[PDB]
Amino acid sequence: MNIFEMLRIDEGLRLKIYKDTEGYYTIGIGHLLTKSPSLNAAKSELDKAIGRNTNGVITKDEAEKLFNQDVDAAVRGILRNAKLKPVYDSLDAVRRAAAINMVFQMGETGVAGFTNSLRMLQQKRWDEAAVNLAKSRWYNQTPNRAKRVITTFRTGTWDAYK
């Protein structure tokens, strides 16, 4: 198991524009297109992202390409962030995948606001961090996915994904 297979399980794959859990125009493997209500603003962003007139539909390869870019960008955002970097560096390889997952889903600002959990993770207080992470809108909105990520932080194994 690795970050790619992990996110592929959490996000699914959709080849036609769809609305995410928050109601936003998304495509592929969790690629947010726009927070605007306009399907046209979404279609525009889509064509811009792919480099072609897509009419709202992409191929698997195109999906995977967006996905490759997004994971990369997620990692780089963590590495560039003064609050996230130290925590991330402190983690083992499995837990690092959990961190990437959160950033991919909620953005760097979002995660960055989990100050207390971040401190707990850095100190390696696993059960404590797990409890604190659950006290969040994130957990309340996407409980099954949150639980999976949280279990990964708690255990340091891929059990939630097996």
Q: Which residues bind Cl ion (CB under 5 A)?
A: 49, 142, 144-145
Both tokens assigned to 8: 């592929």
Residues 6 or more apart in contact with residue 26 via CB below 8 angstroms: 14, 17, 18, 19, 20, 32, 33
Minimum distance, C-beta of residue 31 to Cl ion, in the bound complex (Å): 8
Minimum distance, C-beta of residue 142 to Cl ion, in the bound complex (Å): 4
Minimum distance, C-beta of residue 83 to Cl ion, in the bound complex (Å): 24
Known catalytic residues are 11, 20
Nearer to Cl ion, 53 or 144 (CB): 144
Type of residue numbered 8 = R
Nearer to Cl ion, 34 or 142 (CB): 142
Both tokens assigned to 155: 């255990």
Closest CA to 102 of 34, 152, 140: 152
Instruction: Provide the annotated binding site for substrate.
Output: 32, 104, 117, 132
Instruction: Provide the annotated binding site.
Output: 32, 104, 117, 132
